């Protein structure tokens, strides 16, 4: 449209005012420049430095190389003998990388970050690779067709002037400027212009913090909505760095009857020791008008959701009210509140030991039906079942994965992993966790010591090291094969955990996008993880990304489930003593293996 023309028409006066401002800006900048340069000149003036002398022909080289610096003018060509610089032991190529001990999902960058540089020679006759890459990104490279830039002021003016003569203007703005690239930003700007006000740091439903002066009486659900939405249950972190936010909130069943429920005198101002309050205690299963603040009311509403009857504990957690005051507030407000759900389940079955046999029955069904296409191991996702059981429509069942503790299956879901039971070292095939490659979760295999001794690192279990992250001491040095390499310090026996292969988690298509330039670089870090995600260690990771490929290596890689996450652990294929470089097969296709790794480090023995 004529958005650019209107922007220039407004920019006439806008740039008049801008010139008015920037003349003074330049004057002030030049004044400060003069002052700073004066200070620097004063600091320089105090120092005396020995002048450099010409280079007389040293007696160390009578016959050597001399450079003849010629001139285009009449000046004579000057010849001087070169001084040979002392050699320095260089190091192999290694781009910067941040240390990483866990995994890392990367939001899919739909736009190309920047066109990488290449040798400037091969592309002269094969420049179509650039077009192939841009087609892979479908032309979405940063700054493409930007048509300049907008500081949200000229765009706002154009939107205001774009009257009926909303949506079409939004589409035109998005097309003309990839910075927004969506009608959501245009609608947000439209709403901001129409309202010209903001609720504040709180969401549009103002929910200030309890400890803040802007207290407000808000029900429990809205008060804890932020905590429930942003908290991530799996790896125990708010705004998980390795988990998406698309999950059900904390709305789930709980054990209602888990308290002693013994009436006791809770201080002088107790809920008991009062006939009216004592009667109301059973009924709800002179009230003073105390100044119950908004924060106090909201936190009472929150605390009532964890006991529903215990005025003693709630009031003890209330600094501004007593247990008798708690009962009075209950009779005043919660007497008009909704009745408690008091829901419970039945759970008829009791043969916990026999559950493994049926468990194995489902595993046998999987291994007999989907074995033909069993290579498509799907990334685990905790399935949420509202009312239906863990049936054939269960998202975990269709994913051919056992239900971890993060599942919303029933407490005895048939697809749920019950846990290993090894009394000792459980790296043998007799351990169920090893057969279907997994790490013994520290909530299920209590006999093997995975749960016990979480602080110390002396654990009998050898199938819980990845969870504990007890990697050995490893060292970095140039490799004997190609580029950098990793060398283990202490000796390690066969079939022992050494380290995890950490990196960035990305989608299959994003993995292809990164591998497109990795192939050109001839150096790659892409580690296939599962049918959905690929872990990439190019930007983050640890020392292990330097491990080199070998057709006859001394270590092997294993992709194993670790508390519902596809994690890659490296183990010693054979006994390795001090000072050895670690190798493992990359499982490359033979043609691609020879194309990417064409070094064997040894010839044929016979």
């Amino acid at each position: 449209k004529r958005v650019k023309s209107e922007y220039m028409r407004l920019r006439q006066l806008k740039r008049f005012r801008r010139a008015d401002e920037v003349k003074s800006m330049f004057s002030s900048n030049r004044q400060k420049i003069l002052e700073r340069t004066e200070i620097l000149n004063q600091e320089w003036k105090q120092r005396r430095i020995q002048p450099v002398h010409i280079l007389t022909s040293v007696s160390s080289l009578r016959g050597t190389r001399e450079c003849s610096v010629t001139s285009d003018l009449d000046f004579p060509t000057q010849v001087i003998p070169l001084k040979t610089l002392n050699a320095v032991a260089s190091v192999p190529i290694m781009y910067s990388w941040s240390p990483l001990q866990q995994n890392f999902m990367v939001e899919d960058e739909t736009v190309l970050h920047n066109i990488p540089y290449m040798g400037d020679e091969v592309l002269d006759q094969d420049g179509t690779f650039i077009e192939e890459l841009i087609k892979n990104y479908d032309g979405k490279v940063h700054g493409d067709r930007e048509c300049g830039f907008i500081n949200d002021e000229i765009f706002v003016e154009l939107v205001n002037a774009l009257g009926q003569y909303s949506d079409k203007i939004f589409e035109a703005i998005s097309s003309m400027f990839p910075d927004k690239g969506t009608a959501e930003e245009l609608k947000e700007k439209y709403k901001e212009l129409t309202e010209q006000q903001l609720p504040g740091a709180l969401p549009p439903e103002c929910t200030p913090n309890i400890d803040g002066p802007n207290a407000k009486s808000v029900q429990r659900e809205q008060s804890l909505h932020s905590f429930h939405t942003l908290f991530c249950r799996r790896c125990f972190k708010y705004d998980c760095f390795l988990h998406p936010f698309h999950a059900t909130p904390n709305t789930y069943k709980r054990k209602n009857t888990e308290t002693a429920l013994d009436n006791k005198p809770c201080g002088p101002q107790c809920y008991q020791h009062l006939e009216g309050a004592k009667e109301f205690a059973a009924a709800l299963t002179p009230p003073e008008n105390v100044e119950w603040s908004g924060a106090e009311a909201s936190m009472f509403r929150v605390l009532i959701g964890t006991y529903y009857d215990n005025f003693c504990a709630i009031a003890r957690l209330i600094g501004t009210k007593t247990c008798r005051q708690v009962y009075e507030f209950r009779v005043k407000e919660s007497s008009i509140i909704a009745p408690a759900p008091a829901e419970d389940v039945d759970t008829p079955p009791r043969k916990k030991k026999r559950k493994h046999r049926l468990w194995a029955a489902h595993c046998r069904k999987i291994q007999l039906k989907k074995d033909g296409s069993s290579n498509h191991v799907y990334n685990y996702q905790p399935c949420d079942h509202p009312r239906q059981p863990c049936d054939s429509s269960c998202p975990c069942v269709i994913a051919q994965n056992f239900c971890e503790k993060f599942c919303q299956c029933s407490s005895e879901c048939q697809n749920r992993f019950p846990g290993c039971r090894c009394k000792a070292q459980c790296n043998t095939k007799q351990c169920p966790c090893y057969l279907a490659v997994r790490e013994c979760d520290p909530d299920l295999c209590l006999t093997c010591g995975a749960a016990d001794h979480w602080d110390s690192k002396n654990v009998s279990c050898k199938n819980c090291s990845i969870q504990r992250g007890s990697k050995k001491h490893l060292l970095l040095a140039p490799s004997d094969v190609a580029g950098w390499g990793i060398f283990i310090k202490d000796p390690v026996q066969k079939n022992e955990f050494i380290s995890e292969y950490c990196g960035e988690i990305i989608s299959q298509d994003e993995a292809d996008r990164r591998g497109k330039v990795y192939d050109k670089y001839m150096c790659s870090f892409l580690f296939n993880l599962n049918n959905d995600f690929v872990v990439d260690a190019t930007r983050k990771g640890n020392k292990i990304r330097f491990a080199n490929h070998s057709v006859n290596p001394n270590c092997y890689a294993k992709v194993m489930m670790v508390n519902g996450d596809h994690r890659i652990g490296i183990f010693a294929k054979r006994a390795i003593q001090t000072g050895e470089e670690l190798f493992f097969d990359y499982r490359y296709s033979q043609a691609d293996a020879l194309k990417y790794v064409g070094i064997e480090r040894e010839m044929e023995i016979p």
């Binding site: 192939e132 087609k135 892979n136 479908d138 493994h356 046999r357 468990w359 194995a360 595993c363 046998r364 291994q367 069993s374 290579n375 007799q430 169920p432 090893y434 057969l435 279907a436 490659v437 298509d509 993995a511 292809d512 990164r514 591998g515 497109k516 990795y518 192939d519 790659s524 892409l526 580690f527 296939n528 690929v534 490929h549 092997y556 890689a557 294993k558 992709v559 194993m560 890659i568 990359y586 499982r587 490359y588 296709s589 691609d592 990417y596």
Partner: peptide, 22 residues
């Protein structure tokens, strides 16, 4: 699109289950 596939290093593994005593 996605006609071309990049080369990713892997570590394949599959697992059955143990048969109960009879």
């Amino acid at each position: 699109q996605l006609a071309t596939k990049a080369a990713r290093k892997s570590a394949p593994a599959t697992g059955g289950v143990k048969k109960p005593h009879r």
